[PDB]
Short mmCIF file of C-alpha atoms and ligand atoms in Angstrom, two decimals:
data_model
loop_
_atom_site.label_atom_id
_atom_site.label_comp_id
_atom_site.label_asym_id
_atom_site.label_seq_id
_atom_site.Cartn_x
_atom_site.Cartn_y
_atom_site.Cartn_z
CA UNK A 1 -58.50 -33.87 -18.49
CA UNK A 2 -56.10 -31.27 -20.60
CA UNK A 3 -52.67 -30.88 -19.33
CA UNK A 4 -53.01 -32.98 -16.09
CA UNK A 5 -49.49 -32.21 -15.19
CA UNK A 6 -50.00 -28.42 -15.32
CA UNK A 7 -47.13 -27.57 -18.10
CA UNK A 8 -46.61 -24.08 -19.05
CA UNK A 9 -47.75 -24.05 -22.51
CA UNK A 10 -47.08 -21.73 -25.57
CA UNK A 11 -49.67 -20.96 -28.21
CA UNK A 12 -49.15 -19.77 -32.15
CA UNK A 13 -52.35 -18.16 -33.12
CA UNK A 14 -52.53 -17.32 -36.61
CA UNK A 15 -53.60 -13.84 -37.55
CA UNK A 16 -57.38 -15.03 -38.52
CA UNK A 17 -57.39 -16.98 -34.41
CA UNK A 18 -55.73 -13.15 -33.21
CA UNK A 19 -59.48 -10.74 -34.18
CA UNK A 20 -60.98 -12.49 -30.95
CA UNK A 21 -59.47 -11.92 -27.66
CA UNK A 22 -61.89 -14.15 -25.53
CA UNK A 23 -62.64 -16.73 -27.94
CA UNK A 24 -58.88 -17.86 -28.01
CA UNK A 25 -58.87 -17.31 -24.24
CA UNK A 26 -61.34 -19.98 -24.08
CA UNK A 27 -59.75 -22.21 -26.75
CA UNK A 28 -56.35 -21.90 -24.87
CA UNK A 29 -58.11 -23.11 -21.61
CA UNK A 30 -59.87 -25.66 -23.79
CA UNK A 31 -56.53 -27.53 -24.13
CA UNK A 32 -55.86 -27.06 -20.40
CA UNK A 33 -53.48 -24.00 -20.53
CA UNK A 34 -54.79 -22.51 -17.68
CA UNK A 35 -53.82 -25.71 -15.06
CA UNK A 36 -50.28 -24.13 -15.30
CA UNK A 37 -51.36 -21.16 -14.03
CA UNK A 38 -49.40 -19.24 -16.95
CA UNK A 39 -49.35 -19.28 -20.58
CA UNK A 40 -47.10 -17.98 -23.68
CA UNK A 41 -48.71 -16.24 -26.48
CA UNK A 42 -46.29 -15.74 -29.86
CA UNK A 43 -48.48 -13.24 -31.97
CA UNK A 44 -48.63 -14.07 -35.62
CA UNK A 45 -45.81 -12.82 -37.28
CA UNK A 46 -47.87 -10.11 -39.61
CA UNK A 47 -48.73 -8.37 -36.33
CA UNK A 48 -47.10 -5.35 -34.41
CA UNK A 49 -47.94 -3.69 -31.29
CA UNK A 50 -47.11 -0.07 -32.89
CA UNK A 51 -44.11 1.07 -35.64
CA UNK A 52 -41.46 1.99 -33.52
CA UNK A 53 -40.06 2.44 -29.79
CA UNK A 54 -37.54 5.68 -31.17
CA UNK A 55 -39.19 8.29 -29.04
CA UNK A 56 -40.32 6.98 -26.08
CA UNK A 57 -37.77 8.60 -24.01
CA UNK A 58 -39.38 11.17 -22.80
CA UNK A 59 -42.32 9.08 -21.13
CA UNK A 60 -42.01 9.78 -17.38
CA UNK A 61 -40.94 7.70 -14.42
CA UNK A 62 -42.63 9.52 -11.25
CA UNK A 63 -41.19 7.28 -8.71
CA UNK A 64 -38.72 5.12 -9.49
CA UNK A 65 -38.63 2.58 -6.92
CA UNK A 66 -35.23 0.86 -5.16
CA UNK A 67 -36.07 -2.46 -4.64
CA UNK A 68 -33.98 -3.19 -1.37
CA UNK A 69 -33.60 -6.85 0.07
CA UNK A 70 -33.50 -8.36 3.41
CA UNK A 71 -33.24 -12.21 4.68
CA UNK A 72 -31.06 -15.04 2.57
CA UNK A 73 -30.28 -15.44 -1.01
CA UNK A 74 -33.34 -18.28 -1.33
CA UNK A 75 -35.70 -16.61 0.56
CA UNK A 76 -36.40 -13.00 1.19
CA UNK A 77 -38.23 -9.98 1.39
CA UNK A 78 -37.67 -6.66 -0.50
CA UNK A 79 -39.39 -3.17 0.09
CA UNK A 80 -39.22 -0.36 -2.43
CA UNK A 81 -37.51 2.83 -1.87
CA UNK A 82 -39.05 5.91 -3.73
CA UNK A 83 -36.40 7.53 -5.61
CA UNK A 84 -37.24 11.33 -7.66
CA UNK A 85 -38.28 11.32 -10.83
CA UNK A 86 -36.48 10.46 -14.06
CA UNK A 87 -37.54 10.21 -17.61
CA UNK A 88 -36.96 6.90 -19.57
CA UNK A 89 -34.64 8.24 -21.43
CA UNK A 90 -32.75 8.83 -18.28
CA UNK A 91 -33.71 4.93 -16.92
CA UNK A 92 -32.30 3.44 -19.69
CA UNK A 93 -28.74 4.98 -19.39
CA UNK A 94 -28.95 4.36 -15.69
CA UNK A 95 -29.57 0.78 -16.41
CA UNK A 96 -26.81 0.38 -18.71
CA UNK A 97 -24.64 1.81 -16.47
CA UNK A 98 -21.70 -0.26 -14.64
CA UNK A 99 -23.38 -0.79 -11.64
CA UNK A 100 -26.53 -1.62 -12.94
CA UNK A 101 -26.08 -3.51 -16.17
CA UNK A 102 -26.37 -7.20 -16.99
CA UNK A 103 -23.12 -9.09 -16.12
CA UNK A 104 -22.02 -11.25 -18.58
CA UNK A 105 -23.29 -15.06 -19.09
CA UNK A 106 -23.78 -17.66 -21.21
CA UNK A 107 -27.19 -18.65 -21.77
CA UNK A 108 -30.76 -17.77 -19.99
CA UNK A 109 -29.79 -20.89 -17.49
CA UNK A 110 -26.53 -18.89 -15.83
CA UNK A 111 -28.12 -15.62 -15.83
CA UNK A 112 -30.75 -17.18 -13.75
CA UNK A 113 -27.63 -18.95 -11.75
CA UNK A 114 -25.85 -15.27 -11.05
CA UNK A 115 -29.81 -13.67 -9.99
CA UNK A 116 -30.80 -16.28 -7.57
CA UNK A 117 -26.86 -16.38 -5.86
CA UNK A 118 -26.28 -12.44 -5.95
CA UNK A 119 -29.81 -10.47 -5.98
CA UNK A 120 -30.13 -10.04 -2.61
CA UNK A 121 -26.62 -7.74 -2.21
CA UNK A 122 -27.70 -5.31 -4.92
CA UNK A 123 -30.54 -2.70 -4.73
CA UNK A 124 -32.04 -2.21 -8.69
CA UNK A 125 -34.36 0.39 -9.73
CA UNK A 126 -37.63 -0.19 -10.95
CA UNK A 127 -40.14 1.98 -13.20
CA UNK A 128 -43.43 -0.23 -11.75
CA UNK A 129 -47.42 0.31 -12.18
CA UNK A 130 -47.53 3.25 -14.69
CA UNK A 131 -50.70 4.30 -15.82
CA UNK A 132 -50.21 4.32 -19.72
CA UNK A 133 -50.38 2.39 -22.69
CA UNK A 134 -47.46 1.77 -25.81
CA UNK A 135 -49.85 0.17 -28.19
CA UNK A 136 -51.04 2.09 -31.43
CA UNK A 137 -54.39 3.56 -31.77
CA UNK A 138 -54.42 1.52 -34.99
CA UNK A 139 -53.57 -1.90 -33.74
CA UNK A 140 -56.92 -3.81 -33.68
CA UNK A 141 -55.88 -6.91 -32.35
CA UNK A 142 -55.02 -8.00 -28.76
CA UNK A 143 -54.63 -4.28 -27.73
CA UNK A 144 -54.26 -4.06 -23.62
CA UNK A 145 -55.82 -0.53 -23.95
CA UNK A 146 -58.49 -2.04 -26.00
CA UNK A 147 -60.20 -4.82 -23.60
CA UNK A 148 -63.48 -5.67 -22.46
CA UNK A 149 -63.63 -4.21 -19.10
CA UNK A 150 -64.00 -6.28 -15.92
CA UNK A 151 -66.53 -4.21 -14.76
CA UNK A 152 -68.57 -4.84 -18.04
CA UNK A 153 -67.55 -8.50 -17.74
CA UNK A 154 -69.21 -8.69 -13.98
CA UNK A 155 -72.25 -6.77 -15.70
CA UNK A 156 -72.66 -9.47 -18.64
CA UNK A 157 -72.34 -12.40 -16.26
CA UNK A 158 -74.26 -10.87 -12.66
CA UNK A 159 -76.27 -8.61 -14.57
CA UNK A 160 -75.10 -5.93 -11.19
CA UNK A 161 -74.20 -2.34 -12.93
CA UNK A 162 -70.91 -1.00 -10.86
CA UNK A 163 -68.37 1.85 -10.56
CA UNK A 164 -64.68 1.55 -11.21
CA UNK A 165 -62.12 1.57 -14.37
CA UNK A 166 -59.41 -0.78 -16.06
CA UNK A 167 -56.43 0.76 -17.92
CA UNK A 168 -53.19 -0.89 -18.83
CA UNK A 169 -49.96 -0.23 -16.78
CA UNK A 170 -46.49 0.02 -17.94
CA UNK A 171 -43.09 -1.43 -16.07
CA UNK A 172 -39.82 -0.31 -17.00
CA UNK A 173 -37.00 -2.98 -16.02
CA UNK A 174 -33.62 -3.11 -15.23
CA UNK A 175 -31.24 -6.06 -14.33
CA UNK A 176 -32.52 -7.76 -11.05
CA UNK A 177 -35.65 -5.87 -10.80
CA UNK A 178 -38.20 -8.36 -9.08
CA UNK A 179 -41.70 -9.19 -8.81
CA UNK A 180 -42.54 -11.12 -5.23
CA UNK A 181 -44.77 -14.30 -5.53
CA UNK A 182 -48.53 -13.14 -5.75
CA UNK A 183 -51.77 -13.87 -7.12
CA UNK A 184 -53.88 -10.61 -9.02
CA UNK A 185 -56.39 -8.51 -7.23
CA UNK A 186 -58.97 -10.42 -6.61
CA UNK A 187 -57.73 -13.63 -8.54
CA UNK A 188 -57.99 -11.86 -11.45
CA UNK A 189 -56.00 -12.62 -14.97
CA UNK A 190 -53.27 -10.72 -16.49
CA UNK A 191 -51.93 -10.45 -19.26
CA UNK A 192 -48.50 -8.51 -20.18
CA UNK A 193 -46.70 -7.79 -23.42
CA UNK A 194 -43.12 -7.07 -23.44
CA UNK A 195 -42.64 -4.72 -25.84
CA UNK A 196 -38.72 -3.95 -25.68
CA UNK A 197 -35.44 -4.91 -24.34
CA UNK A 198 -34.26 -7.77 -22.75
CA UNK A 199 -35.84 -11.03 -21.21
CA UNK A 200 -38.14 -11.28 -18.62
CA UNK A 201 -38.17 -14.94 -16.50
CA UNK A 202 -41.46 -16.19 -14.61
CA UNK A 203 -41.76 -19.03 -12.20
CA UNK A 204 -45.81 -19.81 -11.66
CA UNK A 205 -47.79 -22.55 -9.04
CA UNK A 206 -50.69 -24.58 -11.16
CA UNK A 207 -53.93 -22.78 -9.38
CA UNK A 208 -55.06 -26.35 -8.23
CA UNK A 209 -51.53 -26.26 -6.21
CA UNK A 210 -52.05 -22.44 -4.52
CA UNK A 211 -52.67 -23.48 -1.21
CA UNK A 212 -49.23 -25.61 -0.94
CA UNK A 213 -47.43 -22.32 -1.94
CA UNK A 214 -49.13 -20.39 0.98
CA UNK A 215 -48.40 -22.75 3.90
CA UNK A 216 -44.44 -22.74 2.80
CA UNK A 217 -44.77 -18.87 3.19
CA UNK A 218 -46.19 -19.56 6.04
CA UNK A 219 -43.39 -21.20 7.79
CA UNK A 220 -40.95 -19.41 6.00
CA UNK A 221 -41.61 -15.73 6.90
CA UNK A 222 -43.49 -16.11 10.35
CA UNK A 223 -43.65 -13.11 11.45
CA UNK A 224 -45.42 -11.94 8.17
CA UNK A 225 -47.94 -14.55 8.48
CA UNK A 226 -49.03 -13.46 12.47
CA UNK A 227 -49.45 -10.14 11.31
CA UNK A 228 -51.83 -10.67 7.83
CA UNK A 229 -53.88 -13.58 6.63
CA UNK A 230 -52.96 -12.64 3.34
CA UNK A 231 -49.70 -11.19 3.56
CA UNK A 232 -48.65 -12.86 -0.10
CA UNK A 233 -51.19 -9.92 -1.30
CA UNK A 234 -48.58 -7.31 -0.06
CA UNK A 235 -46.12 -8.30 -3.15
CA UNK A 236 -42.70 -8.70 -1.01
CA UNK A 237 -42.29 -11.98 -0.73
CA UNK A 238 -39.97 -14.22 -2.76
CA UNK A 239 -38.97 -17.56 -2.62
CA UNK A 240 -35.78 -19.29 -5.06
CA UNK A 241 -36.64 -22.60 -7.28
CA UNK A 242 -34.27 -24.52 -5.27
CA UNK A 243 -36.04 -23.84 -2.05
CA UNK A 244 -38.98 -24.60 -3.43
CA UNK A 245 -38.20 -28.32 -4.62
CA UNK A 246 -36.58 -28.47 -1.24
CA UNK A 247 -40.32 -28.30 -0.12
CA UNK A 248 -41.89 -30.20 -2.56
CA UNK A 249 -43.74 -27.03 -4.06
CA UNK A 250 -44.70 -27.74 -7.93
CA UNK A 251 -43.92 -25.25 -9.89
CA UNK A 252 -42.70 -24.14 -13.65
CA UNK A 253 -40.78 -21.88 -15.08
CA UNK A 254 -40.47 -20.18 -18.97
CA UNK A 255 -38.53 -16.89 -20.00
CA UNK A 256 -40.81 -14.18 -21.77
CA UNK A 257 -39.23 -12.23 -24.69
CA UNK A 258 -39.82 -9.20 -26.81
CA UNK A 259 -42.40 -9.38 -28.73
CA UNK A 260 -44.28 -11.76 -26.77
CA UNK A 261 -47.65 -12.29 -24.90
CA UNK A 262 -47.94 -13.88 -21.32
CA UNK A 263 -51.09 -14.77 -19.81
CA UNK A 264 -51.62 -15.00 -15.77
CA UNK A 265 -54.87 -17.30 -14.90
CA UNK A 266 -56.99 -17.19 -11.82
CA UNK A 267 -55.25 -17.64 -8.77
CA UNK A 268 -51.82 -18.30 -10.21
CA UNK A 269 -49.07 -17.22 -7.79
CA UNK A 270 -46.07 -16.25 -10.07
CA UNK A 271 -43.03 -14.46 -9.31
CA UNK A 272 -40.35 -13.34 -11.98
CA UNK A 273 -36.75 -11.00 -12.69
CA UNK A 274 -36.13 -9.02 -15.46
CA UNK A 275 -32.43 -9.71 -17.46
CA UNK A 276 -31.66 -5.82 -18.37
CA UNK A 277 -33.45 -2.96 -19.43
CA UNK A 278 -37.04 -3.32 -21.03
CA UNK A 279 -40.56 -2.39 -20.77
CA UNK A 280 -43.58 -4.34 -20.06
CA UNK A 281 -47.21 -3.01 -20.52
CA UNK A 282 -50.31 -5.42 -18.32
CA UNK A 283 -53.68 -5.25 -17.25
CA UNK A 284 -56.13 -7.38 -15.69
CA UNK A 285 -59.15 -8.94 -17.17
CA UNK A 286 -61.83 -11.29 -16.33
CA UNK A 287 -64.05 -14.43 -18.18
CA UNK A 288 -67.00 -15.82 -17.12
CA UNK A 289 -64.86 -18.78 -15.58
CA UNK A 290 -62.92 -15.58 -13.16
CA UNK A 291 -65.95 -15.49 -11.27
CA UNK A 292 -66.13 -17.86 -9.20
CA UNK A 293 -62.33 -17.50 -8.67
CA UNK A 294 -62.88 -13.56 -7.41
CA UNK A 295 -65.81 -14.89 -4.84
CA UNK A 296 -63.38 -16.63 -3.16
CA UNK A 297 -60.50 -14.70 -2.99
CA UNK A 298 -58.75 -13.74 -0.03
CA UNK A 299 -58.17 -10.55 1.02
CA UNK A 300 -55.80 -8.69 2.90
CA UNK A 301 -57.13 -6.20 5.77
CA UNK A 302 -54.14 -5.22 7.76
CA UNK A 303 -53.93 -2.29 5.82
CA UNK A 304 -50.50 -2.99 3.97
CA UNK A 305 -52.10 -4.32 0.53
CA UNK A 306 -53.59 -0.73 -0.26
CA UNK A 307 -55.45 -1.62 -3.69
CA UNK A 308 -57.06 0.34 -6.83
CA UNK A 309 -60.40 2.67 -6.47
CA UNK A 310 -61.86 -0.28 -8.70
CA UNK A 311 -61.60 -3.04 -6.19
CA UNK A 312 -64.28 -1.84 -4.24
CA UNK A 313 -66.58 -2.50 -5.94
CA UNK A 314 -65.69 -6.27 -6.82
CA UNK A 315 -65.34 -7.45 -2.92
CA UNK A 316 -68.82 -5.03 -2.46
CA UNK A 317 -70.79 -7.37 -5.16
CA UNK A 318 -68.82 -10.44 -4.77
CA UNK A 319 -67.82 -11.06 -1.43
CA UNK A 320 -70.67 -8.66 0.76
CA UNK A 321 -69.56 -10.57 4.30
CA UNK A 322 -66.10 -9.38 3.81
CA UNK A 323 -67.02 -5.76 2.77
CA UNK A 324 -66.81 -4.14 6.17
CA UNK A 325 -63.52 -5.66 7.68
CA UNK A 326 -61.69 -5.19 3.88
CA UNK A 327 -62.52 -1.34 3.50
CA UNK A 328 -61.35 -1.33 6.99
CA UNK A 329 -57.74 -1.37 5.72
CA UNK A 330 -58.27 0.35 3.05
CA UNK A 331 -59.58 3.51 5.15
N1 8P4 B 401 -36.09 -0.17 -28.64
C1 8P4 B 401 -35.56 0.66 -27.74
S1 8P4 B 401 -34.58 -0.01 -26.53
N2 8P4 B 401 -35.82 1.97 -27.87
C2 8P4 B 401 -35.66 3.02 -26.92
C3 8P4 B 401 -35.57 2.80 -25.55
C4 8P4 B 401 -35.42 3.87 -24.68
C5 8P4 B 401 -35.37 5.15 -25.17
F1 8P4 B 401 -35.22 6.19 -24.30
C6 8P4 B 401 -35.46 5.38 -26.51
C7 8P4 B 401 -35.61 4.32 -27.39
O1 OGA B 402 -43.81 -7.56 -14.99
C1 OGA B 402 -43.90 -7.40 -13.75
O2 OGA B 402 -43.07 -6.76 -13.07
C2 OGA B 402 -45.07 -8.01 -13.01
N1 OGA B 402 -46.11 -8.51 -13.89
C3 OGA B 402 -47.12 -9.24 -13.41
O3 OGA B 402 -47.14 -9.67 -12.26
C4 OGA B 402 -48.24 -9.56 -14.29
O4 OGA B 402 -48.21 -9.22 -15.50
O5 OGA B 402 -49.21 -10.16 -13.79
NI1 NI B 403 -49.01 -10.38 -11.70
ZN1 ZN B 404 -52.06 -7.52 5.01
#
């Protein structure tokens, strides 16, 4: 077997291996990439994602959202705060400001020090889940706005026409700014592209290994876990490296840069900062291996989760038994 001991590993394509998106999905898993749970994708260096980022500023932030903590510095939940609108323009310089900029550090490995000791007693902003896209028109290769669809995907393998949509989404980050542990709707992939600005650091479970993440959250936020089967699906939780090898939870870690791909795989829990101001673009997507994964997802039905229009119709087709309780929460 390919990468028994579920390393996070980093790919090179060259630009002939870049024309075909799923092929060199399928090679990457061919060498075991997806056991990690996460993957790095450097694009060939003839490739771009568009010319320039000069005049983005004026792309709009709807709701901003304060990401505010509660609990201890290794474990902890946050809830977001909707703040009023403000171009990016108007992000940027509030991210660069003095109470919101990166402190100063030596390498990737003390930044990571100061976030896990200090995030808890700050409150960053975050520009999350923007319907949009950054890439050119033009760019032909390994364009998020430019995928196969899931819903075509389910079509291909189930031969079941549905409903529903899949556009990319856009995050603008600032120092701090936090994504809790989760898996993707429905166990789906990802994949992001950071397209500007500073680092972004991940920390994934192998998929094999999902299960031994859950029962940790579990016992460590208990009154979560009475309330919602699935409460990891509400995207609060988060949990620091050290208290995770206290617990014997295997995990990796890697730190995404500009100009650079990452791939999420079926039910890989991952959790992640951002180092200072950039934007990320993502979007979900499915292979013929994702099925199988999305039939036996779990869901959350307490209500909290509150999903896309589109995921209606993958529980409806995949998991009919479910159906009722699901759109339950979701009504
Ligand atoms: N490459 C970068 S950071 N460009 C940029 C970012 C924000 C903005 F408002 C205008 C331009
Ligand atoms: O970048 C973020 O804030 C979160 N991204 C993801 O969880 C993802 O791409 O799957
Ligand atoms: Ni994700
Ligand atoms: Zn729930």
């Amino acid at each position: 077997a390919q990468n028994p001991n579920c390393n996070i590993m980093i790919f090179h394509p060259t630009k002939e291996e870049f024309n075909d998106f799923d092929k060199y999905i399928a090679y990457m898993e061919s060498q075991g990439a997806h056991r990690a749970g996460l993957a790095k994708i450097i694009p060939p260096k003839e490739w771009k994602a568009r010319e320039t980022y000069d005049n983005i500023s004026e792309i709009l932030i709807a709701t901003p959202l304060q990401q505010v903590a509660s609990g201890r510095a290794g474990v902890f939940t946050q809830y977001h705060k909707k703040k009023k609108a403000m171009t990016v323009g108007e992000y940027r310089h509030l991210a660069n400001s003095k109470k919101y900029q990166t402190p100063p550090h030596q390498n990737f490995e003390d930044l990571e020090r100061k976030y896990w000791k200090n995030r808890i007693y700050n409150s960053p902003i975050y520009g999350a889940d923007i319907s949009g896209s950054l890439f050119d028109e033009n760019t032909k290769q390994w364009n998020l706005g430019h995928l196969g669809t899931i819903q075509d995907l389910l079509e291909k393998e189930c031969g079941v026409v549905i409903e529903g949509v899949n556009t990319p989404y856009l995050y603008f980050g600032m120092w701090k700014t936090t994504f809790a542990w989760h898996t993707e709707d429905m166990d789906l992939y990802s994949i992001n592209y950071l397209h500007l600005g500073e680092p972004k650091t991940w920390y994934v479970v192998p998929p094999e290994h999902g299960q031994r993440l859950e029962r940790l959250a579990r016992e460590l936020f208990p009154g979560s876990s009475r309330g919602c089967g699935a409460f990891l699906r509400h995207k609060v939780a988060l949990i620091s490296p050290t208290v995770l090898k206290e617990n014997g939870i295997p995990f990796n870690r890697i730190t995404q840069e500009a100009g650079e791909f990452m791939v999420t795989f079926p039910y890989g829990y991952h959790a992640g900062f951002n180092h200072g101001f950039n934007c990320a673009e993502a979007i979900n997507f499915a292979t013929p291996r994702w099925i199988d994964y999305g039939k036996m997802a779990s869901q959350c039905s307490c209500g909290e989760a509150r999903v896309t229009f589109s995921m209606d119709a993958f529980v409806r087709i995949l998991q009919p038994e479910r159906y009722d309780l699901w759109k339950r929460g979701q009504d």
